[PDB]
Design a protein around this ligand. Sequence first.
Ligand code: NAG
Ligand code: NA
Length: 312
Amino acid sequence: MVEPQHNVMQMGGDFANNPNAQQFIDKMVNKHGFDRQQLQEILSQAKRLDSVLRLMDNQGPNGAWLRYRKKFITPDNVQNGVVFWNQYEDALNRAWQVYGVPPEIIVGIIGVETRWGRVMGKTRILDALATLSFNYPRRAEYFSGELETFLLMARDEQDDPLNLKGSFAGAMGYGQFMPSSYKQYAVDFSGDGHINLWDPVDAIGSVANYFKAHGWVKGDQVAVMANGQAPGLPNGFKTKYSISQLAAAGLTPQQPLGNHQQASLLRLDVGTGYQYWYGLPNFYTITRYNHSTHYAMAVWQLGQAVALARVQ
Ligand SMILES: CC(=O)N[C@@H]1[C@@H](O)[C@H](O)[C@@H](CO)O[C@H]1O
Ligand code: NA
């Protein structure tokens, strides 16, 4: 009837003689009450993907921004964004009221991440996370905690750990949430009692709660383009200068900056020249989702493009 299989201490597969996997299995049993044998049967099925290890290692004015921008802001993309927006308008409006996060931001995020559920990932999450946990010393501790949370997530949502697919880093669903983002930020916005990252309505609320959690200020400006040039000052979303300093570099806000006394100096390579922007706090909040100036500007502008295509 019952098969304890205590004597089956050594598993097969790609992580068969892996010290890191054996340590992991011990932590899950001890700390979470997992059954060693059941876990071994799972991890023995996990694959060591060289592509995942190669991709994590892989990570003027020549028109940099334009090449990045046109990867997302195209007629076909803006049109699908309109459809997704109108289809999930109730969830989008409800998220605005509860979280203060606007529709165009959530639409832009889901748009750039998975093109609205069209490109969600083809790699099994266990393979990716197990590969980066047991064969990648550089980020092994970070990905171990992600595999840990993933296993617990698959247990809490009654998911079979092997049926779930996503990115090469183990990101999941419409919003490409990492296992730790699911734990800390995902919410049951659809109200069915479950938190599905692959459910459009849950994805919307979770992306909204993520933003609020990271300080998104309702109605506050995201960024404001500047008149003038400032080649002497360093730039990017991590920079920090006062409005007085920026003004001294020869800049001025194309729109009133409110009460803001500081901003980051963003610079977009528009081919013919450089375009400077006053990066406000809401812009930074976007980068907390994906640490990149280009990402954040692409998310915002994509949402803006879709906002206009609905107006018409
Ligand atoms: C939306 C989401 O899950 N974003 C995560 C973010 O929390 C984390 O700070 C970063 C680590 O580099 O990786 C992103 O994938
Ligand atoms: Na739900």
